[PDB]
Design a protein around this nucleic acid. Structure first.
Ligand SMILES: [K+]
Ligand SMILES: [K+]
Ligand SMILES: [K+]
Ligand SMILES: [K+]
Ligand SMILES: [K+]
Ligand SMILES: [K+]
Ligand SMILES: [K+]
Ligand SMILES: [K+]
Ligand SMILES: [K+]
Ligand SMILES: [K+]
Ligand SMILES: [K+]
Ligand SMILES: [K+]
Ligand SMILES: [K+]
Ligand SMILES: [K+]
Ligand SMILES: [Mg+2]
Ligand SMILES: [Mg+2]
Ligand SMILES: [Mg+2]
Ligand SMILES: [Mg+2]
Lengths: 126, 101, 50, 45, 147, 126, 186, 142
RNA sequence: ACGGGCGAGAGACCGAUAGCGAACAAGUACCGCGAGGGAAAGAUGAAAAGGACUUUGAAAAGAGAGUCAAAGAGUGCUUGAAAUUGUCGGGAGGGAAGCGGAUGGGGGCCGGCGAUGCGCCCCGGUCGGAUGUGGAACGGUGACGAGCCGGUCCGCCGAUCG
RNA sequence: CCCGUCUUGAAACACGGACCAAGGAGUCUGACAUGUGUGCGAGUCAACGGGCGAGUAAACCCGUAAGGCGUAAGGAAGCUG
RNA sequence: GAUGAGUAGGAGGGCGCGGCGGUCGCUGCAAAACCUUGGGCGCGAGCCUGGGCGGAGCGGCCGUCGGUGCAGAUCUUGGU
């Protein structure tokens, strides 16, 4: 049960906040869980999805497909993966949007900030 | 404009005498001790050792929800809680969009 | 489900028919219009059936 | 006076209950009064 | 409770119970107490005699506190005595209970009813009626004046 | 199941009581309404006009609400509600509610066949 | 056709059951329905009829009036279908056997202290199934404020009906129609 | 019924979780009761499983023509877990009928519902038999 | 105290003719010389995967074909009532039609529309069989004691029935 | 004989009504009154306010010589009761 | 056993709509809504149900509440 007086349980307000979120907030909202191996290694559960991250889809028609993320379309709330595509009536190839909550991160692109965030997340879990 | 537009100074509240409130509370407490009435109100009490159900004061020191569940199972009141949990559902009608989902 | 302490406090809270309550000033539990609601015991008693 | 048994948990050591039946447990049960009061006071929120 | 309103029972009856001929118009007899002397004279006279005119003297800036004077009858004096004091008075005939009716918020003692039989009572009050004093004296008590 | 009813079902009237002029104006529905007009010939009961319902048409109490098969209807929404008729199978028949799925309808039908309870619409959704 | 008023049907309405939803009152009504049916006692019939009546038709009886009416009949069980209230004007309370629908706390305390008993109507049936050796009493039905306003209109001759006034004083309905010096009197 | 059954009936006859009503409150109204200790599933003081200290329960046990005959214990009304004296009969219909009679009427437990108990036992036995071997006749000939 | 300003939390309130006039580039389009007046207008799909290509046509488009779970979802795209209209099929019609009651002709629909069981015997197959003797738990009454009475289940000797 | 309406009297040469969908009219509040249900009873009313409390607009508790109504009336009034 | 007319008007018992406190249920093995010379119940308000369509919710019962029931108003808006 919510107790903080500065947070609202209103459905309308929560929906408005989610659908008007700026890019910086959308990045956090577009988080995905880490794989079992990565979760065990880093002691972290979920991370924001990045461009060059390796991802395995776990839901939908592409449940077995995996690859490298190639675009994070925050405006559309979807990511794009290397070979997860389809053919139009024209015959050309287009990427299929996949929601990050429905995929699993198998390999992270590590930098100084990424390592700092991983350490910060692991510290709280202890 | 609607006919007879609604106004805030409608008599929303009621002032019931304290003695009648206490009468109602006593009646409800007495009814809670009748197993037939408790069953008739929809509670699954077929496994409770007896009514009124009085438990040791050590339950007041429980801190974890798992221990609370274990106590409920021990006293035979768990099936009612399980029934309550299983009935969780979305409210039909317009009330589901009025923050009562 | 009553804890033992609350069940014990019930007597001091709601008093009884004879004496008054400590927590409710001057309150006494109400009495029903019927002393014994077992209608069969009254209708089939020796006094009535005679 | 009737006596009510106190249920004992595994953790507790004593099974001493024997709490006298409170007088309020034998109060009159009046569905009409309860319904009237409940319906009236539920308006107050 | 809208569902119990009789207009609900009148849905589909055209006139809503106010008649086809007479109808329900805005103010067929005027507003409020209009016509108290002309076309509502019979009602005023038969149900509200004395309504019109003025009697008596005026009293500018009249304060009710200076007229405050609660009264208690002698038949209610005994109820003021606590139970233990009543028992003591019954046991001992050589003394009488001393009731200060002013401490209970009474100024004047009136003389309705009777006192307990063969019971002397000493009453102190701001005022007393002649009959109340006579009854107290007959009972064997006394009256004390205070302020 | 042998119905307990023995008296023959007699209907004082089998025609509907159609609202006056509902044949004339589309906006006037068939559901009965008693005319209240001052001049209404139907209200005045002029011969050769639309008939008005009255308590005199009431059905005999012994055969009232009885279906042509000789049983009375009871709507059942699941197999659990079916057992209520176990001791009343000679007077009451079960009709499965219109919204019950075919899967549950099969279970209800099987249970009723076990209980010798007549189902009025046992072929629905089959 | 038949020359009858309303087709020979009755046009009078009387209570046939309590309007109250009190379950205990309903049980008492069942008890006395059985008693009336299987005994044919006039006392039981009166009790049953009074059990149906409304609040204003079951007025309370004061303790002092009860003592006055029970004078010389203390051995009989006094029965009232209503409430019994205490009276601070009554000093000596004898031992009385009293049956009523309800007792006030003070009245019950005084009756029990005096050595009497307070009985319910089920206990009365157990004691007096036919009402034998009872004193059936009623409270003052017409002793209420609403009754004062009933009767002839205040403004007609020989009428002492109380009028409906928002306040009491010289300026409130005392001038014309109430005095010979202002128009007419009465 | 820790309080007298008549009061319980006065309370629950208006409403309870086991009450099933259909077709409104007019002439079409149909009423039934769901409580397992109601032999005829009828909403009446006689058969009520909530407003009677002594009640009869007859239902089919899980397996093997086992019929559960249970009666509420008169001195254990305040103990729901041990309120029912359960007896599981696996013998022929004749022995089951004899046992039901002995436990219902011969001991003056609830003689007024001996016929209801026997009819309920017969219905349960027939239902079990049909459930085992399936339907073999329509039972429509009068 | 607080129908303005900035920032929050709630509701037995309304749900696109409702709710502020305004859920939308609404005090907008538009009207008036002017003060002012003042609308209508929300919904493809999970994802555009928004219909390649063939053929007829001047073209809009049609006929095929393709996408999708679905086009019976094809960008004013969830669903799609009535008034009103076209087509096919049945029927009727000497200056209205419609309607109440009773039959009939034709059509449409209905198998709880309408049963095949029951009793007594013979043969065969399965399952159990005392008022006897032990065990397990338990009940009615009594006083949630004694005593009396009693059913369910399990194992045995007889009985040889159901 | 076409409904609705006003009317002594409507099928009217009396008025409204071409047709369909949606919307559409005895309500809320204050003062009284009878009736009925409920609580208490010579009393009754804690919600002005205070203590708290579902971490809480609820529920619960609190009347010191508080206050309202009732418990005494009649007089213009002094005043008596 | 007797009896049955009803405008204005009064009252009783019921039908129907949308919420709230409870309770019992249904639903992608297809909810609501809508459609139908399918069928049935009730004197009636209405109700239950077959079939179709639709593609995501809905209902029964006990209390309680309300912006709760249309043929008319040269009624309003839209459509024809
Ligand atoms: K009227
Ligand atoms: K009229
Ligand atoms: K003057
Ligand atoms: K029509
Ligand atoms: K009639
Ligand atoms: K608008
Ligand atoms: K679609
Ligand atoms: K007119
Ligand atoms: K005209
Ligand atoms: K006071
Ligand atoms: K004078
Ligand atoms: K519900
Ligand atoms: K249908
Ligand atoms: K409702
Ligand atoms: Mg008039
Ligand atoms: Mg059409
Ligand atoms: Mg005071
Ligand atoms: Mg509303």
């Amino acid at each position: 049960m919510k107790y903080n007086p500065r947070v609202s349980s209103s459905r309308r307000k929560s929906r408005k906040a989610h659908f008007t979120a700026p890019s910086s907030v959308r990045r956090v909202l577009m988080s995905a869980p880490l794989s079992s191996d990565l979760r065990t290694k880093y002691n972290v559960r979920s991370m924001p999805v990045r461009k060059d991250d390796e991802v395995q889809v776990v839901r939908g028609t592409y449940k077995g497909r995996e690859g490298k993320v190639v675009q994070v379309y925050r405006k559309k709330w979807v990511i794009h993966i290397e070979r997860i595509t389809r053919e139009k009536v024209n015959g050309s190839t287009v990427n299929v949007g996949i929601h990050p909550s429905k995929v699993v991160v198998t390999k992270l692109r590590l930098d100084k900030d990424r390592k700092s965030l991983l350490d910060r997340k692991a510290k709280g879990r202890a | 404009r609607m006919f007879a537009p609604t106004k805030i100074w409608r008599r929303w509240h009621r002032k019931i005498p304290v003695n009648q409130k206490r009468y109602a509370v006593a009646s409800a407490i007495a009814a809670s001790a009748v197993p037939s009435l408790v069953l008739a109100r929809g509670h699954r009490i077929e496994s409770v050792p007896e009514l009124p159900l009085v438990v040791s004061d050590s339950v007041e020191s429980i801190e974890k929800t798992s221990n609370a569940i274990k106590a409920l199972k021990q006293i035979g009141a768990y099936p009612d809680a399980e029934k309550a949990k299983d009935s969780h559902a979305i409210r039909p009608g317009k009330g589901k969009m009025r923050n009562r989902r | 489900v009553w804890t033992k302490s609350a069940y014990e406090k019930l007597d001091g809270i709601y008093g009884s028919f004879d004496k008054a309550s400590e927590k409710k000033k001057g309150y006494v539990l109400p009495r029903p219009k019927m002393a014994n609601a077992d209608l069969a015991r009254i209708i089939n008693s020796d006094e009535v059936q005679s | 006076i009737p006596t009510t048994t106190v249920q004992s948990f595994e953790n507790d050591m004593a099974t001493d209950g024997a709490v006298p039946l409170p007088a309020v447990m034998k109060a009159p049960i009046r569905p009409d009064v309860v319904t009237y009061v409940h319906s009236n006071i539920s308006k107050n929120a | 409770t809208t569902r119990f309103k009789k207009n609900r029972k009148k849905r589909g009856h055209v006139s809503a119970g106010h008649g086809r001929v007479g109808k329900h118009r805005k103010h067929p007899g005027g507003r409020g107490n209009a016509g108290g002397m002309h076309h509502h004279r019979i009602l005023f006279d038969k149900y509200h005699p004395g309504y019109f005119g003025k009697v008596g003297m005026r009293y500018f800036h009249k304060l009710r506190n200076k007229f405050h004077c609660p009264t208690i009858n002698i038949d209610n004096l005994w109820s003021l005595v606590p139970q233990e004091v009543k028992d003591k008075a019954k046991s001992s005939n050589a003394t009488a209970p001393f009731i200060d009716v002013t401490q209970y918020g009474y100024f004047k003692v009136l003389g309705k009813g009777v006192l307990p039989q063969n019971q002397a009572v000493v009453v102190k009050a701001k005022l007393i009626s002649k009959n109340a004093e006579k009854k107290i004296k007959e009972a064997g008590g006394a009256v004390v004046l205070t302020a | 199941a042998v119905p307990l009813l023995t008296k023959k079902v007699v209907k004082k009237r089998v025609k509907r009581f159609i609202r006056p002029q509902s044949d004339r104006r589309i906006t006037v529905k068939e559901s009965w309404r008693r005319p209240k007009g001052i001049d209404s010939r139907v209200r005045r009961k002029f011969k050769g006009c639309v008939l008005m319902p009255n308590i005199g048409y009431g059905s005999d109490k012994k055969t009232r609400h009885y279906l042509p098969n000789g049983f009375k209807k009871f709507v059942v929404h699941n197999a659990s509600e079916l057992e209520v008729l176990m001791m009343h199978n000679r007077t009451y028949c079960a009709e499965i509610a219109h919204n019950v799925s075919t899967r549950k309808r099969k279970e209800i039908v099987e249970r009723a066949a076990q209980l010798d309870v007549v189902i009025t619409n046992k072929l629905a959704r089959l | 056709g038949i020359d009858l008023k309303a087709g020979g049907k009755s046009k009078k309405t009387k209570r046939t059951a309590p309007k109250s939803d009190d379950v205990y009152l309903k049980l008492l009504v069942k008890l006395y329905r059985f008693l009336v049916r299987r005994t044919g006692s006039k006392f039981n019939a009166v009790i049953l009829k009074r059990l149906f009546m409304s609040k204003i038709n079951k007025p309370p009886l004061s303790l002092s009036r009860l003592i006055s009416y029970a004078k010389g009949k203390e051995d009989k069980v006094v029965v009232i279908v209503g409430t019994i209230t205490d009276d601070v004007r009554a000093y000596e309370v004898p031992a009385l056997k009293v049956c009523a629908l309800r007792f006030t706390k003070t009245a019950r305390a005084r009756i029990e202290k005096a050595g009497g008993e307070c009985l319910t109507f089920d206990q009365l049936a157990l004691r007096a199934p036919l009402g034998q050796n009872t004193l059936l009493l009623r409270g003052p039905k017409n002793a209420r404020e609403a009754v004062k306003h009933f009767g002839p209109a205040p403004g007609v001759p020989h009428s002492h009906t109380k009028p409906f006034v928002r306040s009491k004083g010289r300026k409130f309905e005392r001038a014309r129609g109430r005095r010979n010096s202002r128009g007419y009197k009465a | 019924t820790t309080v007298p059954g008549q009061l319980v009936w006065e309370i629950v006859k208006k409403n309870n979780s086991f009450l099933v009503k259909e077709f409104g409150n007019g002439t079409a109204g149909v009423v039934f009761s769901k409580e397992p200790n109601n032999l005829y599933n009828l909403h009446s003081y006689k058969h009520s499983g909530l407003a009677n200290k002594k009640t009869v329960t007859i239902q089919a046990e899980g397996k093997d023509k086992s019929v559960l005959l249970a009666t509420s214990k008169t001195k254990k009304q305040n103990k729901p877990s041990t309120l029912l004296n359960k007896s599981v009969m696996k013998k022929e219909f004749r022995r089951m009928s004899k046992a039901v009679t002995n436990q219902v009427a011969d001991n003056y437990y609830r003689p007024d519902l001996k016929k209801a108990a026997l009819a309920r036992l017969s219905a349960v036995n027939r239902s079990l038999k049909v459930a085992k071997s399936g339907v073999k006749k329509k039972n429509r000939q009068a």
